[PDB]
Amino acid sequence: SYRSRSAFKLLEVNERHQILRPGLRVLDCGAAPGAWSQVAVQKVNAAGTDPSSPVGFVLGVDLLHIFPLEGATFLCPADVTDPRTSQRILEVLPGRRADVILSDMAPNATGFRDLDHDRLISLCLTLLSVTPDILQPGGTFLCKTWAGSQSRRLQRRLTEEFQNVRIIKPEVYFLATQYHG
Ligand SMILES: C[S@@+](CC[C@H](N)C(=O)[O-])C[C@H]1O[C@@H](n2cnc3c(N)ncnc32)[C@H](O)[C@@H]1O
């Protein structure tokens, strides 16, 4: 059971791409209500439920309150784009780095379609710009984005900074792996 149907999208992405595994430290951006965080805790063994496997770590961040989850730490309210938020992230992550950065952040909808899409792409870019401080070299970045003209900039930057960038469909996700960075 999950706090949101979003879980199922992350479960499917991980099934194919194998981005979550025991021991990995995960940062989950736009984590409320916490379904991606629930998946992440299970797959990286953050609650230690499996004694036979490394114990990962999960930190979720959102503007909105997140109810406690066994095996995750949450920072809320916290704006992922606020410089204070990165420092708080660095203070909490084991070894001051994450192995996987997940992002399901989206602006609140306005009914202006280009504007909402562009704002989404902008969030992804701001997060990528703070990734050098947070993301383990070799690590993974998965973000919700929109697929079009304004997205090409984000896709180019990911291509420069990761060995491999996949576009994943049925909303669009970029999955960038093997951070140089
Ligand atoms: C679709 S929900 C995420 C659902 C989550 N992945 C889950 O599985 O429960 C999008 C979230 O992005 C958050 N968000 C939007 N902009 C943000 C920002 N600048 N910093 C932190 N969170 C943000 C929103 O508050 C909202 O909760």
Query: What is the C-alpha separation between 49 and 73, in angstroms, rounded?
Result: 16
Question: Ligand 1: distance of its center to the CA of 104 in Å?
Answer: 6
Q: Which residues pair with 140 in a beta bridge?
A: 100
Which residue bears the tokens 């984000």? 154
Our count of domains for the chain comes to 1
Number of H helices, E strands in the chain: 5, 7
Residue at 39: amino acid letter: V
Task: Determine whether the annotation assigns residue 80 to a binding site.
Answer: yes
3 within ligand 1 shell (Cβ under 6 A): yes
60 within ligand 1 shell (Cβ under 6 A): no
Q: Specify the experimental method.
A: X-ray
130 within ligand 1 shell (Cβ under 6 A): no
Catalytic site includes residue 144: yes
- Taking the chain, what is the end-to-end CA distance rounded to the nearest angstrom? 36
Assigned token pair, 85: 């938020």
This structure's resolution (angstroms)? 1.8
In order, the DSSP letters of 104-166 are ---PPP-S-HHHHHHHHHHHHHHHHHHHHHHEEEEEEEEEEE--SGGGHHHHHHHHHHEEEEE
CATH code of residue 88? 3.40.50.150
Domain ranges, residue 120 = 1-181
63 within ligand 1 shell (Cβ under 6 A): yes
Query: What is the C-alpha separation between 82 and 60, in angstroms, rounded?
Result: 15
- 18 sits in the region (left: phi over 0; alpha: psi -120 to 50; else beta) called left
Q: Is 168 exposed, middle or buried (0-12, 13-18, 19+ CB in 10 A)?
A: middle
In degrees and rounded to multiples of 5, residue 163 shows phi and psi of -65, -35
Q: What is the CA radius of gyration of the chain?
A: 15
Q: Whose CA is nearest to atom 23 of ligand 1?
A: 30
**Nearest alpha carbon to residue 98 among 140, 62, 70, 63:** 140
The catalytic position among 9, 43, 144, 169 is 144
